[PDB]
Amino acid sequence: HHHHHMKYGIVGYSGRMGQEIQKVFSEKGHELVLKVDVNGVEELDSPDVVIDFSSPEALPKTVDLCKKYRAGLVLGTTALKEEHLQMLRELSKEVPVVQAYNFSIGINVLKRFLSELVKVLEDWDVEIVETHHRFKKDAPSGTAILLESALGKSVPIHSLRVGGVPGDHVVVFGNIGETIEIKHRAISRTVFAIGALKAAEFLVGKDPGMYSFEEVIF
Amino acid sequence: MKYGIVGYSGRMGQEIQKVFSEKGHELVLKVDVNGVEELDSPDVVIDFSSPEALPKTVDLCKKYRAGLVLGTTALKEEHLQMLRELSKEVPVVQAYNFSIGINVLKRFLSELVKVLEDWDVEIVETHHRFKKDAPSGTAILLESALGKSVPIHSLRVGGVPGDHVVVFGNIGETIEIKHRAISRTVFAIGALKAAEFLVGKDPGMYSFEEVIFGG
Amino acid sequence: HHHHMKYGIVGYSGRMGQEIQKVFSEKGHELVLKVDVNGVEELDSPDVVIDFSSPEALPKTVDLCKKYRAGLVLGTTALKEEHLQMLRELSKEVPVVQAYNFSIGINVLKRFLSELVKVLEDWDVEIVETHHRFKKDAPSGTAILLESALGKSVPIHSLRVGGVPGDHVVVFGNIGETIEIKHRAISRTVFAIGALKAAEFLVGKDPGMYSFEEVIF
Amino acid sequence: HMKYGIVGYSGRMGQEIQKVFSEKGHELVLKVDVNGVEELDSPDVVIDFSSPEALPKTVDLCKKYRAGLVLGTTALKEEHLQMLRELSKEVPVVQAYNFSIGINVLKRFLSELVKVLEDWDVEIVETHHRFKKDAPSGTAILLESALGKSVPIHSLRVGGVPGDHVVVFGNIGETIEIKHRAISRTVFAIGALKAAEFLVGKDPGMYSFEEVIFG
Ligand SMILES: NC(=O)c1ccc[n+]([C@@H]2O[C@H](COP(=O)([O-])OP(=O)(O)OC[C@H]3O[C@@H](n4cnc5c(N)ncnc54)[C@H](O)[C@@H]3O)[C@@H](O)[C@H]2O)c1
Ligand SMILES: NC(=O)c1ccc[n+]([C@@H]2O[C@H](COP(=O)([O-])OP(=O)(O)OC[C@H]3O[C@@H](n4cnc5c(N)ncnc54)[C@H](O)[C@@H]3O)[C@@H](O)[C@H]2O)c1
Numbered sequence: 001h002h003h004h005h006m007k008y009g010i011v012g013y014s015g016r017m018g019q020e021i022q023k024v025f026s027e028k029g030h031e032l033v034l035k036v037d038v039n040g041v042e043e044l045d046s047p048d049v050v051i052d053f054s055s056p057e058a059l060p061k062t063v064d065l066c067k068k069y070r071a072g073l074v075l076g077t078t079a080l081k082e083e084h085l086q087m088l089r090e091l092s093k094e095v096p097v098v099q100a101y102n103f104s105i106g107i108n109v110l111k112r113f114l115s116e117l118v119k120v121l122e123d124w125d126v127e128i129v130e131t132h133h134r135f136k137k138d139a140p141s142g143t144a145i146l147l148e149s150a151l152g153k154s155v156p157i158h159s160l161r162v163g164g165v166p167g168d169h170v171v172v173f174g175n176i177g178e179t180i181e182i183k184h185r186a187i188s189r190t191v192f193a194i195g196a197l198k199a200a201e202f203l204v205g206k207d208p209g210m211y212s213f214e215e216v217i218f
Numbered sequence: 219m220k221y222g223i224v225g226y227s228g229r230m231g232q233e234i235q236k237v238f239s240e241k242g243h244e245l246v247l248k249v250d251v252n253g254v255e256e257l258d259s260p261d262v263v264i265d266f267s268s269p270e271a272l273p274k275t276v277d278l279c280k281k282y283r284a285g286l287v288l289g290t291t292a293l294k295e296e297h298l299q300m301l302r303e304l305s306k307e308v309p310v311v312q313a314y315n316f317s318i319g320i321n322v323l324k325r326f327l328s329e330l331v332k333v334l335e336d337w338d339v340e341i342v343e344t345h346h347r348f349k350k351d352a353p354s355g356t357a358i359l360l361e362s363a364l365g366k367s368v369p370i371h372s373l374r375v376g377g378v379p380g381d382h383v384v385v386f387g388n389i390g391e392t393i394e395i396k397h398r399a400i401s402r403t404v405f406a407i408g409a410l411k412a413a414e415f416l417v418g419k420d421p422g423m424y425s426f427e428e429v430i431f432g433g
Numbered sequence: 434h435h436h437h438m439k440y441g442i443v444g445y446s447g448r449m450g451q452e453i454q455k456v457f458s459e460k461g462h463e464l465v466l467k468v469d470v471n472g473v474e475e476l477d478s479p480d481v482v483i484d485f486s487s488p489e490a491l492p493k494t495v496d497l498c499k500k501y502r503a504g505l506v507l508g509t510t511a512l513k514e515e516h517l518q519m520l521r522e523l524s525k526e527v528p529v530v531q532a533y534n535f536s537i538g539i540n541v542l543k544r545f546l547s548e549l550v551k552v553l554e555d556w557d558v559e560i561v562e563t564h565h566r567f568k569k570d571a572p573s574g575t576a577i578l579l580e581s582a583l584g585k586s587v588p589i590h591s592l593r594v595g596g597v598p599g600d601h602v603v604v605f606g607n608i609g610e611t612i613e614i615k616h617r618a619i620s621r622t623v624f625a626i627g628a629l630k631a632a633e634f635l636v637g638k639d640p641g642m643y644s645f646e647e648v649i650f
Numbered sequence: 651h652m653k654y655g656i657v658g659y660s661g662r663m664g665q666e667i668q669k670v671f672s673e674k675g676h677e678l679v680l681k682v683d684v685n686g687v688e689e690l691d692s693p694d695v696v697i698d699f700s701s702p703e704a705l706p707k708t709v710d711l712c713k714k715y716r717a718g719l720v721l722g723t724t725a726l727k728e729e730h731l732q733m734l735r736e737l738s739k740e741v742p743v744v745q746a747y748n749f750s751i752g753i754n755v756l757k758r759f760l761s762e763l764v765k766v767l768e769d770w771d772v773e774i775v776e777t778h779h780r781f782k783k784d785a786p787s788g789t790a791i792l793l794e795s796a797l798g799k800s801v802p803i804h805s806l807r808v809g810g811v812p813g814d815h816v817v818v819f820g821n822i823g824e825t826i827e828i829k830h831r832a833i834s835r836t837v838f839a840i841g842a843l844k845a846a847e848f849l850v851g852k853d854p855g856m857y858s859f860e861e862v863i864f865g
């Protein structure tokens with residue numbers, strides 16, 4: 001289940017997520033050998049795995065680095081487009097890849113449940129309310145989009161950008177007599193960095209291809 | 219559909235008329251403590267009255283081969299027996315709670331707790347200031363769905379019809395599942411869904427869960 | 434307190450209109466005027482008119498109030514500058530109470546939020562409001578009212594779900610903490626009761642615009 | 651720039667305090683926890699988030715070094731308050747059961763709001779991480795005191811929740827909830843730093859954290 005002294009890279013090493021990843025990975029004795037952010041690339045040694053929480057525009061560099069080092073990829077960057085998914089599919093023919101818009105247990109558990117619930121609550125009104133810290137660049141959140149896809153239809157998404165909220169999502173179902181709310185809260189960013197570590201450890205030694213974070217966890 | 223109401227004059231009965239008429243259904247049979255009024259043949263009968271009314275209800279359903287949605291509480295063994303005999307001839311849905319949401323959630327929570335078995339779980343329930351019993355029966359039903367004893371916290375404030383919250387937590391995350399009863403209309407809506415389900419069905423007893431889930 | 438008022442309802446057939454009839458009749462007041470999208474029914478002269486309908490109805494409301502010199506309790510939301518002007522003109526002749534929210538809690542909170550925003554001036558603030566699926570206006574009047582108590586425009590998020598009578602949440606956030614101030618109308622009856630208080634207040638008053646805060650505080 | 655001590659240096663709050671204080675360039679010269687005392691130099695101020703049983707040592711150290719005290723430990727008893735008063739004749743002290751801006755702003759607002767909503771029912775729901783030893787929380791007690799009367803407190807002990815408090819007011823027709831959430835424990839350490847900087851150079855006595863914030 002675990003790997004000893006992995007060498008790893010981070011794309012987005014300087015950002016919020018990047019620094020959480022360094023803290024979590026270093027505590028488990030893993031070694032940072034590759035740093036990429038908007039200001040450059042720093043290659044110190046060959047990574048076994050690369051972790052990317054940055055921006056979609058960075059993904060070409062990320063993929064090239066993974067190909068260069070035959071390093072697996074844990075990708076958390078949100079707001080990916082079709083072009084980005086194609087690049088990942090190409091990469092996955094060479095290395096193991098885990099791409100997820102949310103590295104928590106609870107969102108991935110709920111996303112499955114919501115796919116079943118929506119079928120029984122098909123005639124109820126449904127909206128999503130998501131809340132994140134003030135400087136989050138993307139709205140709606142990737143996670144809101146992920147939950148909307150689990151619902152199997154387009155729903156109103158409301159995005160709050162407030163304080164230092166790590167990430168809350170609420171799915172609201174309503175009928176004339178009652179309401180149901182399904183709420184998830186990430187207590188800190190560390191929970192995503194721990195998910196990323198689980199995914200990294202899963203990937204090491206795997207054959208090439210795309211793996212779901214659900215497979216990582218279930 | 220053509221439908222009847224036993225208890226048409228009561229709180230629930232007036233709520234049923236509103237909800238059914240809004241969907242374009244036709245009231246053709248009215249029963250209360252003061253009498254029976256047969257206007258046309260009902261496809262389904264809806265009963266929220268009193269256990270003493272059930273004999274007449276059963277008789278009417280047999281007469282018109284009409285299905286029955288039964289919400290009357292405090293039924294005795296004798297009432298259950300009448301109901302079983304009726305269900306040999308017509309389709310029947312009996313439930314002591316037609317909140318659709320609570321029923322849906324109770325199943326959902328039985329599955330969710332297995333996945334989140336190492337998460338801490340508590341219940342917070344809120345009712346109006348006069349509610350005599352704590353914890354509420356719904357909180358006890360939800361605890362039973364969770365398959366284990368959990369802390370239940372009971373707030374008694376103002377005129378709240380009924381809220382229930384199941385809180386799951388681990389070190390890095392929290393999940394809350396909440397249900398809010400806006401009002402008595404929630405049960406009339408449940409009864410509408412059961413009525414529409416029952417139309418055209420083969421005789422027998424159907425659980426409200428299978429109304430909501432297609433078994 | 435005024436015994437056996439004669440009153441009219443604009444919007445008598447709507448959700449609020451029916452709640453008004455129930456609340457007013459229970460206090461022994463008499464409905465003498467009914468106005469809806471389908472017509473006008475004048476049975477007797479009203480002392481007061483209660484309007485929870487649509488801004489398009491306001492011209493007829495005003496005309497009726499002028500005709501019978503009847504005061505006006507107005508709850509209709511999404512009023513425009515033209516509607517406010519017709520109201521001002523009306524209030525030269527009769528007493529008027531216009532409010533986007535007739536509950537105790539919201540009116541208590543609005544004062545509390547004016548003070549709280551001053552102390553939490555550097556915190557981010559947004560509003561989340563929730564109403565039933567058929568509500569025609571977004572954002573709600575009450576959200577606008579709350580913004581105005583905060584002394585600034587803020588993001589308002591409007592959910593239109595099921596049968597929710599009316600929820601409003603003001604969210605304040607800092608880097609290390611959040612505060613939410615939430616109000617829930619358990620039923621629509623709370624607004625009809627507010628309207629009744631406002632109607633009783635208005636009877637015998639001199640012409641002008643009166644705030645519902647004045648009605649209650 | 652300050653020399654400071656921490657009672658509870660090894661705990662959750664203790665490690666947060668070290669991070670926040672060292673980032674502002676303050677120097678840790680005294681470490682106390684359940685396994686011992688480590689005196690490196692004389693502190694100007696001591697910060698104590700530990701256990702009520704540690705308070706005697708905390709007091710003795712502050713007297714020894716004539717150091718101010720910032721005390722966050724909860725579940726203090728009359729005896730602990732007495733020792734603290736005695737200490738405060740010699741040094742400046744800030745004791746608080748919550749070091750967040752939001753709670754100390756709300757407590758004042760709840761004192762006024764409860765007067766206006768005197769006939770509304772009121773309860774408190776508080777939620778903290780699974781390991782919290784004391785229930786109800788000191789903050790819940792503080793809020794109850796701002797409300798000027800005894801109120802039902804419901805305590806959830808779930809996962810890793812830093813600290814949530816909800817004051818629920820209810821009437822027949824409406825409800826009001828006033829909720830505070832501590833996003834991380836850092837917020838309390840930052841409060842403790844504000845308190846420690848306030849205390850420097852102050853006359854002896856007890857100062858409220860509200861005075862530290864000025865309102
Ligand atoms: N999947 C998950 O569980 C999850 C969780 C949290 C955040 N995220 C996502 O992670 C991403 C980063 O979030 P954050 O809060 O750390 O943002 P951030 O702004 O703090 O960090 C961005 C990092 O990316 C770098 N960067 C930005 N654009 C770049 C470019 N075009 N080329 C190279 N480097 C670039 C920055 O220099 C910085 O190091 C976002 O897309 C966010 O939504 C995903
Ligand atoms: N299952 C649910 O979802 C649900 C929810 C709420 C209430 N209930 C139940 O519904 C029933 C009705 O509740 P309610 O609040 O409408 O009460 P109610 O007192 O307002 O109405 C009672 C109705 O029953 C009629 N009735 C009583 N005895 C009768 C008799 N023997 N013969 C014919 N009619 C008779 C009355 O005439 C009246 O119309 C109760 O048993 C209650 O427990 C069920």
Ligand SMILES: NC(=O)c1ccc[n+]([C@@H]2O[C@H](COP(=O)([O-])OP(=O)(O)OC[C@H]3O[C@@H](n4cnc5c(N)ncnc54)[C@H](O)[C@@H]3O)[C@@H](O)[C@H]2O)c1
Nearest residue numbers: 444446447448449469470486487490508509510533534535
């Ligand atoms: N101020 C408050 O405390 C408060 C509280 C609740 C609702 N409201 C407001 O009350 C108003 C109506 O709410 P509702 O839920 O009752 O609406 P509704 O749709 O249920 O009823 C609308 C009523 O207005 C009538 N109407 C519509 N257009 C008309 C016209 N051109 N001329 C005459 N009558 C017309 C309809 O026939 C109906 O009787 C809205 O503006 C709503 O936002 C205010």
Ligand SMILES: NC(=O)c1ccc[n+]([C@@H]2O[C@H](COP(=O)([O-])OP(=O)(O)OC[C@H]3O[C@@H](n4cnc5c(N)ncnc54)[C@H](O)[C@@H]3O)[C@@H](O)[C@H]2O)c1
Nearest residue numbers: 658660661662663683684699700701704722724747748749
């Ligand atoms: N006032 C506030 O703003 C606030 C905020 C958070 C926590 N707290 C309180 O702070 C205290 C500590 O919380 P925590 O979560 O960091 O607890 P913790 O369990 O992580 O740490 C307790 C610390 O105190 C030490 N300790 C215990 N008994 C001792 C003794 N007899 N002598 C010397 N040291 C002893 C431990 O070694 C440890 O260093 C609690 O009382 C908690 O309620 C207060």
